Design a protein around this ligand. Structure first.
Ligand SMILES: Nc1nc2c(ncn2[C@@H]2O[C@H](COP(=O)(O)OP(=O)(O)O[C@H]3O[C@H](CO)[C@@H](O)[C@H](O)[C@@H]3O)[C@@H](O)[C@H]2O)c(=O)[nH]1
Ligand SMILES: Nc1nc2c(ncn2[C@@H]2O[C@H](COP(=O)(O)OP(=O)(O)O[C@H]3O[C@H](CO)[C@@H](O)[C@H](O)[C@@H]3O)[C@@H](O)[C@H]2O)c(=O)[nH]1
Ligand SMILES: [Ca+2]
Ligand SMILES: [Ca+2]
Lengths: 149, 149
């Protein structure tokens, strides 16, 4: 009912906007975390960690599930600074190139201690901590992440 | 993308809707509520608002929805962003067999009553209510009352 069967997720992505939380994650030196995405959309691009909110899931609960899933560290929504509403449009989707993906995105910024994360490998094949100037200069960082800086 | 009934049902069953709610003020410090004829929140006084469609920008949705809800097209620049809210209902647009979930973007703006053309498709009556009056009535849905808390 929350994590959908692929068939139902496909209908959802084809038919309506997804709602996601994007995390602008700072370290103690003022650098920010980007992961190199292994899944579509934005496959192969460096992107901020984040993910979609599920059916009947509160934003408070989603924030905890997603920080744990993306960073290996569960944080409460009270730790985040609301960072605006954004919109991400991609010509492809998780399953291929047959339809587009649309996210309405809630940004949240917060600082962590790098040593306390347990970065997972399911959705990203590499992670880097970059300065705003550095990430803004690279076309390998997706435009939808660059705009946060 | 106005979905056929089958796919709207699958969408509502499976994922949050994204909507814009309008906190609309007149020249008397009163706010517009309509008595809803559709589920969810059927039969309650509620602020005007509606869902964002697939591949529709928030800017375009604001124009479409102000026109559809108020009879007057307004650009998103007319609205003052008024938070992210979450509405959970035990019923849905076509029955009582599954729940509806909205992630909601609120917008506040003032209008001249004589410039609106209030439609009758989704509401059977409209009133401009003071915060005190709307807070004192259980016929105003809790999800609208909280905008004035
Ligand atoms: N079967 C199934 N798969 C799902 C579901 N929800 C997500 N997935 C898949 O599970 C993986 C993790 O999904 P998320 O972490 O929720 O979303 P995401 O696609 O990483 O979203 C992030 O990246 C986008 C593209 O860069 C961003 O635009 C977005 O805001 C967010 O940061 C992805 O492979 C996604 O396709 C579901 O209900 N069912
Ligand atoms: N078939 C179909 N029907 C749709 C679709 N989108 C909306 N509808 C239906 O078309 C009508 C108008 O839709 P909206 O204005 O988008 O939604 P809503 O029912 O008004 O939602 C508003 O009220 C909720 C309950 O009070 C609020 O919680 C919400 O934020 C918003 O103000 C409603 O009968 C709704 O069920 C679609 O893609 N396909
Ligand atoms: Ca993710
Ligand atoms: Ca409506």
């Amino acid at each position: 009912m929350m994590f959908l069967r692929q068939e139902d997720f496909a209908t959802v992505v084809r038919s309506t906007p997804l709602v996601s939380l994007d995390f602008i994650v700072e370290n103690s030196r003022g650098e920010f975390l980007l992961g190199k995405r292994t899944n579509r959309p934005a496959q192969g691009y460096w992107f901020v960690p984040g993910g979609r909110v599920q059916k009947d899931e509160t934003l408070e609960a989603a924030f905890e599930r997603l920080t744990m899933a993306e960073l290996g560290l569960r944080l409460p929504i009270t730790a985040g600074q609301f960072y605006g509403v954004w919109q991400h449009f991609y010509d492809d989707n998780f399953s291929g190139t047959d339809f587009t993906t649309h996210y309405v995105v809630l940004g949240f910024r917060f600082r962590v201690a790098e040593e306390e994360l347990l970065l997972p490998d399911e959705q990203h094949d590499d992670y880097r901590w970059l300065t705003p100037d550095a990430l803004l200069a690279s076309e390998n960082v997706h435009a939808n992440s660059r705009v946060y800086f």
